[PDB]
Structures are given as structure tokens and as C-alpha cells.
Amino acid sequence: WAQSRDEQNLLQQKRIWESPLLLAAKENNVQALYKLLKFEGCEVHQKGAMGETALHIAALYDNNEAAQVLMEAAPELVFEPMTSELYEGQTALHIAVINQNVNLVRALLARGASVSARATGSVFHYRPHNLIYYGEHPLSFAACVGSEEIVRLLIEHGADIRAQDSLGNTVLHILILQPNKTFACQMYNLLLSYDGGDHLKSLELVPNNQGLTPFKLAGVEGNIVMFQHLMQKRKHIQWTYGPLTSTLYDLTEIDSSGDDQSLLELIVTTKKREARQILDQTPVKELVSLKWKRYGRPYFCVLGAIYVLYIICFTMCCVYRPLKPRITNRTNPRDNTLLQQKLLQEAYVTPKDDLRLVGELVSIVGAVIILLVEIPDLGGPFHVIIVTYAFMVLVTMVMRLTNSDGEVVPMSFALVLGWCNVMYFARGFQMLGPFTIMIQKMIFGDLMRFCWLMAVVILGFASAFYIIFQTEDPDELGHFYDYPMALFSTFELFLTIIDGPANYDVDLPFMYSITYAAFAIIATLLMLNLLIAMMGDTHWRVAHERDELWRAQVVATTVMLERKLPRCLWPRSGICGREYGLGDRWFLRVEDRQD
Numbered sequence: 001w002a003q004s005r006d007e008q009n010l011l012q013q014k015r016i017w018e019s020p021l022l023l024a025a026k027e028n029n030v031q032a033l034y035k036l037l038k039f040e041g042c043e044v045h046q047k048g049a050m051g052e053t054a055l056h057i058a059a060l061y062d063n064n065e066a067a068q069v070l071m072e073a074a075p076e077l078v079f080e081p082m083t084s085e086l087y088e089g090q091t092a093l094h095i096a097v098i099n100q101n102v103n104l105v106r107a108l109l110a111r112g113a114s115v116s117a118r119a120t121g122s123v124f125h126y127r128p129h130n131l132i133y134y135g136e137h138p139l140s141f142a143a144c145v146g147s148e149e150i151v152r153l154l155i156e157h158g159a160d161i162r163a164q165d166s167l168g169n170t171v172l173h174i175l176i177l178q179p180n181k182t183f184a185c186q187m188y189n190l191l192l193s194y195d196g197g198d199h200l201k202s203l204e205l206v207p208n209n210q211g212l213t214p215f216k217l218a219g220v221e222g223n224i225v226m227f228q229h230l231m232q233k234r235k236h237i238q239w240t241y242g243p244l245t246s247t248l249y250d251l252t253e254i255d256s257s258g259d260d261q262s263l264l265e266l267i268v269t270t271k272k273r274e275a276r277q278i279l280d281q282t283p284v285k286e287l288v289s290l291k292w293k294r295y296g297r298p299y300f301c302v303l304g305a306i307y308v309l310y311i312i313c314f315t316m317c318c319v320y321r322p323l324k325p326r327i328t329n330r331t332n333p334r335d336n337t338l339l340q341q342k343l344l345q346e347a348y349v350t351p352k353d354d355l356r357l358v359g360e361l362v363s364i365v366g367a368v369i370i371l372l373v374e375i376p377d378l379g380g381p382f383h384v385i386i387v388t389y390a391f392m393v394l395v396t397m398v399m400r401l402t403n404s405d406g407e408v409v410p411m412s413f414a415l416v417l418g419w420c421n422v423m424y425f426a427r428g429f430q431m432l433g434p435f436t437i438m439i440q441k442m443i444f445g446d447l448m449r450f451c452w453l454m455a456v457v458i459l460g461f462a463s464a465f466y467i468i469f470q471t472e473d474p475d476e477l478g479h480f481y482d483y484p485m486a487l488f489s490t491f492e493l494f495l496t497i498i499d500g501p502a503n504y505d506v507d508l509p510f511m512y513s514i515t516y517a518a519f520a521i522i523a524t525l526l527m528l529n530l531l532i533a534m535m536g537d538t539h540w541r542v543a544h545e546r547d548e549l550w551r552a553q554v555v556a557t558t559v560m561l562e563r564k565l566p567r568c569l570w571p572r573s574g575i576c577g578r579e580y581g582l583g584d585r586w587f588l589r590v591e592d593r594q595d
């Protein structure tokens with residue numbers, strides 16, 4: 001698809017070269033323009049390859065003299081938008097605004113150009129393949145390019161600031177998505193002065209079609225500069241007392257008020273890395289930290305203590321299980337067999353099995369609640385693990401209820417998952433907090449990078465160890481008799497977790513001494529590289545990534561508790577405005593100091 005527009009741009013330049021009219025507009029050849037329009041009368045409405053006019057060409061190459069001649073010789077061309085699918089809707093005013101050609105904009109002003117004309121072309125979509133997203137309307141273009149002169153010049157002649165684009169985004173939303181934040185704060189504040197000024201229907205409330213006001217979009221986008229500028233509207237100051245300044249914050253669109261209206265939920269859900277810094281801002285970081293110090297951290301330790309007691313109950317119900325009498329003469333055939341197994345299907349004997357019978361009941365009623373609080377639908381893995389645990393005890397109470405021969409196969413998956421899920425609560429206390437973040441980011445990151453190389457390497461040498469020690473009885477030295485144990489043992493030789501095949505009472509094969517020497521050297525090389533490849537994330541920037549991503553996870557956890565927990569526990573943060581001078585809304589007191 002990228003070649004299509006490249007072909008069409010090269011095709012356009014060919015049609016610019018072929019068409020002498022469009023050529024004179026590109027080169028500003030005013031002397032040639034008259035000869036083609038008067039002395040050898042051609043079509044002045046001559047369309048280009050992009051459905052453009054000679055005026056559309058004279059617009060992007062900033063030569064007003066060629067555009068002036070076309071609008072004087074045919075004032076019908078101004079209203080015409082480009083008809084091609086790439087550039088559909090773009091008038092000659094759009095190009096004049098985005099190129100900051102103020103004189104062409106003011107000349108198209110006198111022609112009565114459409115200020116409400118929508119540029120719906122595929123090159124104006126908010127997509128990665130478009131280098132920028134300036135919007136739909138020419139007023140949106142004037143605000144994004146950073147020309148306050150064109151913004152006011154457009155509003156003077158009927159430009160509607162409320163006009164929402166293809167994605168229902170107002171011009172205020174579009175300024176948040178721009179790069180130059182420090183300058184665009186004046187443009188945002190400038191555009192708001194033209195608003196009606198009524199307390200209702202203010203343009204700061206007109207939301208994106210994805211339910212997002214401009215103040216709320218700044219947080220999700222990670223625009224730290226706009227979010228601070230957008231905070232002064234929502235900031236009340238109680239008093240100034242020496243160096244201290246008790247300031248009262250609004251907390252309306254911030255914090256858990258509605259379902260998905262809360263900014264905090266939008267910050268933790270969005271994948272934007274910059275959005276985590278809105279959490280560290282003065283109005284919010286004081287909120288979430290106080291939501292954590294009280295009603296946040298204690299309940300997380302309660303659920304932690306409950307879960308630890310819930311699992312240590314289920315774990316204690318797994319060490320004590322129905323007895324496993326071999327009771328078969330199958331143990332003598334196939335010396336490899338090493339099992340004493342099975343159930344005898346009875347839990348009704350009522351001695352001390354009733355203690356683990358209610359322990360099994362607690363596990364099932366706990367799992368069905370776990371499966372009925374999570375499946376009704378970052379700390380993702382440590383929440384998928386919980387439902388797979390509940391899934392694994394629904395396969396350790398159903399197939400195990402019907403007397404399965406291998407009923408311990410899914411009980412081990414249930415055990416390690418829910419047990420290693422306890423360090424989910426490691427984000428509770430500060431010491432273990434950032435440590436659990438480091439192990440999680442390193443699994444998807446650096447485990448795959450070394451495991452695929454380890455897999456390719458062990459596959460090489462485990463096969464070369466199979467092929468040599470298949471040519472030998474495994475009664476002695478039999479470290480890898482068949483291919484499953486060939487991959488398993490060599491995988492273990494790779495991690496120094498076996499003594500390595502070593503038998504000296506009897507002689508070894510000729511090639512093992514040579515092959516394992518190369519293996520031990522490559523095994524340590526890849527092991528040292530694995531040690532120093534994950535070392536790369538020890539930079540001073542990562543030190544913040546170690547700490548902040550834990551805080552971001554704690555705040556993400558802090559919202560996870562309050563959203564589902566009842567209202568009687570954990571009251572609404574801040575103090576309500578009713579019974580005070582304010583108006584039934586909840587505000588946060590934060591006093592600081594300036595040195």
C-alpha cells in the first residue's frame with residue numbers, strides 16, 4: 001500500500017510534467033499560466049492525478065502568485081475539494097493553512113472558502129502510516145501547525161471550535177496528540193477563550209467518541225506538560241502560610257467515581273509507557289499513596305493472609321491424600337516401573353479425613369468464587385495464574401472424582417501455579433515490591449532470547465549424545481538412553497545441575513570426551529552471556545523502571561481492590577463538598593512547601 005501512494009506521487013509529478021497548466025502552477029510560471037488560459041484556451045478545471053486542481057498544486061508549493069492567477073481567472077476552483085481517495089475533502093484552504101501561507105489563507109478568505117470542509121482523505125487518518133494527525137477541519141490544522149494567527153483568522157469567519165472530526169475529537173483533543181507540548185499549551189489556552197463560557201456544555205467537557213475529555217485524554221496519552229496545564233482549572237488554593245500552600249484538588253474526572261469514567265483505571269489499562277508518569281504527578285500521587293496507606297495496603301494484606309491460609313490449607317490437603325497401595329503384580333514386569341498409586345474412592349469413612357474433606361470443600365468453594373470473580377470479564381500473569389489454578393482444581397475435582405489413573409498430573413499444575421502466585425502479594429510490602437517486577441519483565445524479555453538459543457544448542461548436543469551413548473548399554477553410565485532422556489539430561493548438563501557423564505572404572509567412547517568438552521565451553525559461554533545480557537538493564541534509567549513500575553503496579557492493584565469491594569468499607573477518597581462551601585463533589589487537601 002505504501003508503494004501505491006509513492007506510485008501516485010510519482011504519477012502526479014508525471015501528470016504535473018505532462019499537463020502544462022499544472023506545471024506552471026508548480027514552477028510559479030505566471031507568464032505560462034496566462035498563455036494556457038487565454039490564448040490557447042484549455043480547461044481551467046483540469047484535474048490532476050490526485051483529483052487536484054491547478055490551485056491545489058499552487059497551494060502546497062508556496063507561490064501565491066500562481067494561486068492568485070487561478071482564483072482570479074476562475075473563482076470556481078476554490079470551493080472544489082480534491083476528489084481522489086487519498087486526498088478526499090482537502091480544499092485549497094487546507095493546504096494553505098497547514099503550509100502557514102497566511103496570505104493565501106486570507107485570500108481564500110475573501111473568496112468565501114468553506115471553513116467547515118472536512119478532509120476525510122486516507123492520508124488524514126490518525127494512523128501510524130501518516131506521519132502526523134492534524135484532524136478534519138482547517139481550524140484543526142491551524143492549531144496543530146502552531147500558527148495562532150491562522151486560528152483566530154479562521155474563527156473570525158465561522159470556524160466552529162466544537163467541530164468534532166472523524167473520531168469525534170475536538171480541536172482540544174488533537175493538540176494533546178502533538179509533539180511540541182511546551183508551545184501548544186498557549187494554543188490550547190487560546191482556543192478555550194473563544195468558548196461560550198457557560199458552565200454547561202463547555203468544550204473541555206465535550207468528550208471523544210471513545211469517552212474521553214481533553215483533561216482525561218492527556219493522562220492516557222502520557223502528555224505530562226498538558227496534564228499539568230490542564231490541572232490549574234481543577235486546582236483550588238486554600239491559603240498561603242509562609243512557605244506552605246494548602247491547595248485543594250478537584251478529583252472529579254480523576255479517581256474512581258464512575259465505572260470507566262475514572263482516569264486512574266485508564267492510566268493503568270493503557271499500554272503507553274509515558275502514562276505511568278501521570279501517576280507520579282502532584283494531584284494524583286498524593287491520592288493513590290493515601291489510598292494505599294489506608295484501606296488499600298491493609299486489605300491487600302488481608303486478602304494476602306487469607307490467600308496464604310487458603311493455599312496452605314489446599315497444600316496441606318495435597319500432602320495428605322487417598323492412600324496409594326500398589327496392590328498389583330505389575331511392578332515386577334518392566335523393571336523401569338516405579339509406582340504405588342490410586343484412590344479406592346472413599347471420603348465418607350469419617351475419621352480424620354473429615355478434616356481434609358472440609359479442606360477440599362473450602363478449596364472448591366474458594367475456586368468457584370475465584371472463577372466467579374476473575375472470569376467475569378501489569379499484574380496480568382499473576383491473575384491468569386489464579387484462574388488456571390481454579391481451572392486446575394476443577395480438573396482436580398472432576399476427573400479425580402471419577403477415579404482417574406493419573407489424577408496427580410493436573411494437581412501438580414494446580415499446586416505450583418497457586419503457590420508461586422503468592423509472590424503476587426510481594427508488591428504489597430516495599431522490599432519484595434520492585435523485585436517481582438524485575439523477574440516478570442525479564443521472563444518475556446531475556447528468557448526467550450536465551451531459551452531459543454539453549455533449545456537449539458541442547459538439540460544439537462543431546463542428539464550427538466544420544467547417537468554416541470545409544471551405542472552403549474545404559475546399565476553403566478547410562479545418562480541418556482533414549483531421546484526424551486537425551487534431551488532432558490543434556491538440558492541438565494547445560495545448567496551444571498548434573499555431575500556430567502563420568503564413569504572411569506570402565507572406558508568411555510572416543511567422541512564423548514571431545515563432544516562434551518565443546519559442550520561445556522559453549523554451555524558456559526551462553527550461560528555467562530545470559531548472565532551479562534540481562535545485566536544490560538542495570539542502567540540508572542532502569543533503576544527508576546525497577547521502582548516506578550512497582551508503584552504503577554501497586555496503584556493498579558489499589559484500584560483493583562476498591563472497584564469490586566463494597567462501599568461500606570473503603571470510603572470515597574477526599575472530603576465531600578456538601579455541608580461545605582463547595583458543591584457535592586469530593587476534594588483532596590494537599591499542602592506543600594517551596595524552598
Ligand SMILES: C[C@@H]1NC(=O)N[C@@H]1CCCCCC(=O)O
Pocket residue numbers: 050052056057060087122123124129130131132
Ligand atoms: C503532497 C501531496 N500532493 C497534494 O496535492 N496533496 C498531498 C499532500 C501530502 C500530505 C500527506 C500527509 C500524510 O502523510 O498523511
Ligand SMILES: [Ca+2]
Pocket residue numbers: 496
Ligand atoms: Ca555449580
Ligand SMILES: [Ca+2]
Pocket residue numbers: 498499
Ligand atoms: Ca554431583
Ligand SMILES: [Ca+2]
Pocket residue numbers: none
Ligand atoms: Ca555460578
